[PDB]
Design a protein around this ligand. Structure first.
Ligand SMILES: Cc1cc2nc3c(=O)[nH]c(=O)nc-3n(C[C@H](O)[C@H](O)[C@H](O)COP(=O)(O)OP(=O)(O)OC[C@H]3O[C@@H](n4cnc5c(N)ncnc54)[C@H](O)[C@@H]3O)c2cc1C
Length: 353
């Protein structure tokens, strides 16, 4: 009995690792010709560190990541503190694991290196879908008993199931890494204004590398673009823009379709399953939660009963996914002094299936 995973992103690589460690036969097929360490940071909450704990990766991630004492929300124009969300040791004791911000590329490499060698295949772009046959752009094919669609917002699995999907992006994310101003650079801060924001944090425990990602109404960017976009923001933000060397700009969708969890022998996770706006910045975390829950369900039913496994998987994920959807719709996440326990203290492995 064979599982094929389409996409070796954070969601698909986590599923591969968890499913192989559960003793299942798994191969992963990734379209990219090569592996790239994304030059970006990422947030990993305690709820997902407990999943990395099951993989055996939690201790390594703690050594690599920055452990902010607080998440600060600050008014972009005034620098007023809108929220001082306690993390650090409090997070460790209250939620049962660390909150970290980490180099996304190095996390991603570590995650793929946890997969069994010789089971991850690059340059395998899925072009078409008892059993499931997968046809790849390079002319080869493979077969499996179930297929996991972890192929992101442009999922081919989703497209094969539902058709073409209607076509637009009126906002972007600027991303930059910064490597004199350390006294005013807090380890995890979100600067807000009425229609845009900048999220800033360190990528490592060394704190020698400081990352920002924005969301702004709207390839290589430039400092002139950043300055106009953030005209009026606090001196700290201007110093960040001034300290950049290279800035890139990424398009964000104005809308997303409704969740698709499974159909027949095909099951979906992460952005392929429940794409949504990155307001909360928990999408990768939700992808890894999907992988962990899906693994728990296939562990209950075995692969011979994939229909029950897929039903249990949707049943045990749809409410939490829907909560994240509605909070991210409000676009209020940590804007005020709120209790984040429902996200960070969530106990994925204690949930009765
Ligand atoms: C600005 C922005 C900031 C964010 N910040 C955070 C954060 O701080 N913390 C967090 O948890 N989340 C964050 N997210 C969300 C997160 O990036 C995504 O939710 C996450 O990447 C989804 O993971 P995934 O595995 O489902 O899909 P992806 O990461 O998109 O991976 C999909 C993989 O499948 C491959 N693939 C695609 N199509 C095919 C095909 N036909 N055939 C074969 N392979 C294919 C792809 O090349 C890719 O490698 C952010 C998102 C945005 C836009």
């Amino acid at each position: 009995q064979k599982i094929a995973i389409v996409g070796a992103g954070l969601g698909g690589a986590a599923a591969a690792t968890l499913l192989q460690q559960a003793g299942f036969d798994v191969e992963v097929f990734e379209q990219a010709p090569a592996f790239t360490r994304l030059g970006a940071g990422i947030h990993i909450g305690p709820n997902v560190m407990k999943i990395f704990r099951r993989m055996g990766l939690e201790q390594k991630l703690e050594l690599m990541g920055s452990h902010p004492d607080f998440w600060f929300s600050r008014d972009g124009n005034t620098g007023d503190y809108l929220s001082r969300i306690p993390l650090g040791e409090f997070a460790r004791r209250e939620y049962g694991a660390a909150y970290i911000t980490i180099h996304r590329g190095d996390l991603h490499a570590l995650q793929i290196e946890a997969i069994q060698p010789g089971t991850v295949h690059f340059g395998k772009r899925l072009e078409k879908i008892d059993q499931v046959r997968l046809d790849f752009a390079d002319g080869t094919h493979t077969v499996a008993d179930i297929v996991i669609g972890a192929d992101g917002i442009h999922s081919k699995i989703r497209e094969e199931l539902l058709g073409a999907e209607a076509p637009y992006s009126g906002w972007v994310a600027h991303r930059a890494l910064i490597r004199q101003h350390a006294d005013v650079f807090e380890p995890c801060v979100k600067w807000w204004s009425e229609d845009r924001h900048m999220m800033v944090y360190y990528t490592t425990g060394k704190r020698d590398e400081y990352y920002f990602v924005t969301g702004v109404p709207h390839v290589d960017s430039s400092q002139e673009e950043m300055r106009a976009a953030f005209e009026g923001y606090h001196p700290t933000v201007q110093k960040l823009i001034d300290a950049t060397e290279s800035i890139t700009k990424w398009p964000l969708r104005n809308r997303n379709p409704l969740p698709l969890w499974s159909r027949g022998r095909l099951v979906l996770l992460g952005d392929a399953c429940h794409p949504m706006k990155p307001h909360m910045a928990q999408g990768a975390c939700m992808a890894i939660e999907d992988a962990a829950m899906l693994t728990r369900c296939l562990q209950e039913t075995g692969l011979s009963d994939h229909r029950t496994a897929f039903a249990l998987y949707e049943a045990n994920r749809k409410e939490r996914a829907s909560q994240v959807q509605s909070v991210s719709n409000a676009n209020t996440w940590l804007y005020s002094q709120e209790d984040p326990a429902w996200v960070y203290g969530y106990d994925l492995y204690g949930q009765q299936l």
